[PDB]
Structures are given as structure tokens and as C-alpha cells.
Design a protein around this ligand. Structure first.
Ligand SMILES: *[C@@H]1O[C@H](CO[C@@H]2O[C@@H](C)[C@@H](O)[C@@H](O)[C@@H]2O)[C@@H](O[C@@H]2O[C@H](CO)[C@@H](O)[C@H](O)[C@H]2NC(C)=O)[C@H](O)[C@H]1NC(C)=O
Ligand SMILES: COC(=O)/N=c1/nc2n([nH]1)[C@H](c1ccc(C#N)cc1)C(C#N)=C(C)N2c1cccc(C(F)(F)F)c1
Ligand SMILES: *[C@@H]1O[C@H](CO[C@@H]2O[C@@H](C)[C@@H](O)[C@@H](O)[C@@H]2O)[C@@H](O)[C@H](O)[C@H]1NC(C)=O
Length: 216
């Protein structure tokens, strides 16, 4: 997150760090005790048997007894199309179920097909690059939905009046709009925080019936 701020500790208890050897590489969202959802590009080319799913985290640099760590049992995809940057969504089934508490909560999803109008206010968040290197403390950022310089196959967002946006390592992190997870961070254009191209998220609302079929 470039140009954002520290989140309050455990403000977003559905927020997940995907890690290897350990080190954060992608965000994810807890959508049921035994499922997280993330971007398909986060795990294409990764050995998922090595991925650790870290719930309840805030400051990645510290020991945190609030954390719960799972492994990935299986992956559900939905036509991931990297060439056209489409269907950037995966559901990872965990090897066990999270204990739901103050620091670990299931996210709330929108209605199937629900669109967001130009001007909708959301928060992006994640432990991605700050502009520097990876964040230790979870970061958040106020962003605004734009439909211009964005396909109907994405939710796009832009910060106006300064350069700020998601960046590497924020991939797969939720975009929360009106208390609901409406995006998963997917791609940027013009480099991070260009101040020109909107950031692009997988449109979770298009995938809700598919998500519901998997998690129950
Ligand atoms: C910056 O964002 C904050 C928080 O965004 C809201 O809550 C998120 C979880 C998500 O649901 C977004 O779509 C929401 O916009 C905004 O904080 C709200 O601020 C209003 C003032 O109008 C206040 O009444 C609410 O209680 C705040 N909500 C929360 C949950 O903190 C804030 O307004 C945004 N600031 C700007 C300038 O856009
Ligand atoms: C047309 O412009 C364009 O292709 N931009 C890209 N940006 C990509 N990619 N491509 C790559 C990519 C490749 C395919 C898809 C899809 N669907 C999404 C992203 C990539 C990988 N791996 C990352 C991390 N990212 C990337 C960089 C910075 C932030 C993000 C985030 F997901 F956070 F938005 C993602
Ligand atoms: C679920 O997995 C937890 C963490 O697994 C660890 O990370 C994975 C990627 C492998 O490296 C694995 O060998 C590590 O243990 C376990 O701690 C936990 O016991 C598991 N829970 C179950 C099986 O219910």
C-alpha cells in the first residue's frame, strides 16, 4: 500500500497473510472458518503445499500470539485467464477450521451481481510494498471506485489529488466497500500509485454464487 496508513491493530479480522518460508507474499480474506479467498495470480507458479495461511496477524515483524496458521488442503479456481487478466480469484480450503474470535472473523460478501457506482468509497489494505519494501504493520488506504479506464470485468479504484494505491504484495487482499468484500487486488498499470491508471480488483460480486457453492 503506497500512501496509506497503519490500520488499527486487528481492525480487519478477516484479513489474511499468505506466507512462504515465513515471508508474506500475498493477502487473502477469510470467507468461512476453513476457506480463504485470494487472487489466482498469487498461487499460479507457487507450490501450494508450502503456503502458510496466517490469520489474526497485524505486525508481521513481531511474535503475535493472536495468530493462527493453516496449510492449504485444496484449491478452487474459476477460469483464471492471466492473458486477458480475467477471473483472478481462487478459493483455498484450509487443513482445519479457524477459531473465530476478536482477531479472526469471517468477511461479509455482497449480493450476486451487485455493481458499485462511480464514487463509491472503499478501503484497500495489505502488507504490500510501501513505495519502502514490504509493510510490517498492516496498511489501509481510502480509495474511490471509478468506472472509467476500467472493464466491467473488474472493480477499479483511484485516489485523486495525490499518488497512492496498492502495490506488490497487496495482490489477493480484500477491497472493503460498504462493510462488504467487493474486490480482491488483481493488477496495476503505470507502476504502483501512478496517479493515472485506476487499480484493478477481481469483482467479488460476480463470483458470489460460485463462492457460496464451495463454502456452503
Ligand atoms: C475513509 O474511509 C473510512 C472507512 O471507510 C468505511 O468503512 C470501510 C470498512 C468500508 O466500508 C468503506 O466503504 C467505508 O467508507 C471512512 O470512515 C466512515 O467515515 C464516516 C464519515 O462520513 C463515519 O461516519 C463512519 O463511521 C466511518 N466508518 C468507519 C467504519 O470507520 C472515511 O469517511 C473515509 N474518508 C474519506 C475522506 O473518504
Ligand atoms: C496491464 O497491466 C498489468 O498486466 N499489470 C500487472 N500487475 C500485476 N501483473 N500484471 C501480474 C498479474 C498477472 C495476471 C493477473 C490476472 N488476472 C493479475 C496480475 C502480477 C503477477 N504475478 C502482479 C503481482 N501484478 C501486480 C502488481 C502490483 C500490484 C498488484 C495488485 F494485485 F496488488 F493489484 C498486482
Ligand atoms: C494445519 O497446518 C498447520 C501448519 O502447517 C505448517 O505449514 C505447512 C505449509 C507445512 O509446512 C506443515 O508441515 C506445517 O506444519 C499445522 O500446524 C496444523 O497442525 C494443521 N492442522 C490440522 C492438520 O488440523
Amino acid at each position: 500500500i503506497v500512501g496509506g496508513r497503519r490500520a488499527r491493530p486487528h481492525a480487519w479480522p478477516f484479513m489474511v497473510s499468505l506466507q512462504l518460508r515465513g515471508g508474506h507474499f500475498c493477502g487473502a480474506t477469510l470467507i468461512a472458518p476453513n476457506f480463504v479467498m485470494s487472487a489466482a495470480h498469487c498461487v499460479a507458479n507457487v507450490n501450494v503445499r508450502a503456503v502458510r495461511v496466517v490469520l489474526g496477524a497485524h505486525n508481521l515483524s513481531r511474535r503475535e500470539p493472536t495468530r493462527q496458521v493453516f496449510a492449504v488442503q485444496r484449491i478452487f479456481e474459476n477460469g483464471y485467464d492471466p492473458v486477458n487478466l480475467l477471473n483472478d480469484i481462487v478459493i483455498l480450503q484450509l487443513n482445519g477450521s479457524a477459531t473465530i474470535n476478536a482477531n479472526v472473523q469471517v468477511a461479509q460478501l455482497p449480493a450476486q451481481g451487485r455493481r458499485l457506482g462511480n464514487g463509491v468509497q472503499c478501503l484497500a489494505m495489505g502488507w504490500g510494498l510501501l513505495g519502502r519494501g514490504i509493510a510490517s504493520v498492516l496498511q489501509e488506504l481510502n480509495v474511490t471506485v471509478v468506472t472509467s479506464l476500467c472493464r466491467r470485468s473488474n472493480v477499479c479504484t483511484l485516489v485523486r489529488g495525490r499518488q497512492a494505491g496498492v502495490c506488490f504484495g497487496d495482490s489477493g487482499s480484500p477491497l472493503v466497500c460498504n462493510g462488504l468484500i467487493h474486490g480482491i487486488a488483481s493488477f496495476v498499470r503505470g507502476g504502483c500509485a501512478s496517479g493515472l491508471y485506476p487499480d484493478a480488483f477481481a469483482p467479488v460480486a460476480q463470483f458470489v454464487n460460485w463462492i457460496d457453492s464451495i463454502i456452503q
